């Protein structure tokens, strides 16, 4: 196969423009073309072999500019291309892909906490708003299972949330699901087998090392083995049936730690370190550059 874990942007003292790719097969890191604009609180995703960086903000010494940007990285060219901008800036965004379409979920613009959701069509290079969430959510976790979109936890500006909701695309409708056992803002949210996982995040007191998973058949959340490191604002992705969490913040350090969850053994292990500690990255998986 030859797939890599791509980490784009993130935060250490200011927003970063780094694009770096980890190869699970050999433990190597490649530095690739920098983002055109520094970004943190962005999400990453892949459609048709292309890496997309969505939303976030540029938190610089001179400014905090919330991002409406969609930018596309082609591993074949090692080049970033601007795409159509979203309706609204969305810092601390959540993203998921259904049937080749990018869903942009919630996030902040200054003191505004979005419930709005919009869907990108890569071939037409267009965004359109779809039904808003039932809840204003920033730092929201998003994943896709069986062509249904899940929005998990976050922050409404008053309360960190344990709530979650599911979007039924054929009905353009959101419905609440069972809440998580734990309040989580800025958790890593991904799908593995028939479950939605929520790893780490921030409960309004501490960065979390707990991980819980939602079984879509049974509609329950169950804790699994905790991560070795407490982390908020972590990157997450799935590669060859294992969860990878990248960086984040433990209340003391910007982590370079990358941990890997094996669902067969219910254990986490340390598999590599990023080249530098950072939080708020976008992460996704695709083919290695040329």
């Amino acid at each position: 196969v030859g797939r890599l874990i791509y980490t784009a942007g993130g935060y250490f003292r200011q927003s970063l423009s780094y694009l770096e790719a980890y190869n699970p097969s050999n433990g190597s890191w490649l530095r690739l073309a920098d983002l055109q604009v520094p970004r943190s609180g962005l999400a990453g995703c892949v459609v048709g072999g292309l890496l997309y960086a969505v939303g976030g903000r540029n938190n610089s010494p001179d400014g905090n500019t919330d991002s409406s940007a969609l930018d596309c990285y082609n591993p074949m060219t090692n080049q970033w291309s601007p795409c159509a901008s979203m309706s609204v800036p969305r810092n601390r965004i959540g993203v998921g892909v259904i049937d080749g379409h990018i869903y942009a979920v919630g996030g902040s613009h200054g003191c505004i906490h979005h419930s709005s959701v919009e869907r990108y069509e890569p071939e037409r290079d267009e965004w359109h708003l779809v039904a808003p969430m039932l809840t204003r959510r920033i730092g929201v976790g998003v994943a896709v299972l069986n062509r249904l979109l899940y929005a998990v936890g976050g922050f409404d500006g008053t309360n960190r949330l344990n709530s979650a909701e599911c979007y039924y695309p054929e009905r353009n409708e959101w419905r609440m699901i069972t809440p998580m056992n734990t309040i989580r803002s800025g958790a890593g949210v991904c799908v593995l087998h028939n479950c939605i996982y929520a790893a780490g995040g921030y409960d309004g007191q501490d960065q979390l090392n707990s991980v819980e998973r939602y079984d879509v058949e049974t509609e329950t959340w169950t804790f699994v083995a905790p991560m070795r490191h407490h982390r908020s604002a972590l990157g997450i992705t799935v590669h060859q049936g294992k969860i990878y969490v990248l960086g984040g913040y433990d209340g003391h350090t910007f982590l370079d730690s990358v941990e890997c969850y094996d669902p067969d053994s219910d254990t986490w292990s340390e598999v590599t370190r990023m080249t530098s500690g950072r939080s708020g990255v976008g992460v996704a998986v695709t083919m290695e550059p040329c």
Binding site: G10, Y11, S15, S40, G41, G56, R57, N59, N91, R92, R160, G186, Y202, G204, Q205, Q207, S232, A233, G248, Y249, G251, S279, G280
Partner: peptide
């Protein structure tokens, strides 16, 4: 009431 600590983006 809650807190947040350092900046994370």
């Amino acid at each position: 009431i809650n807190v947040r600590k350092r900046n994370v983006e």
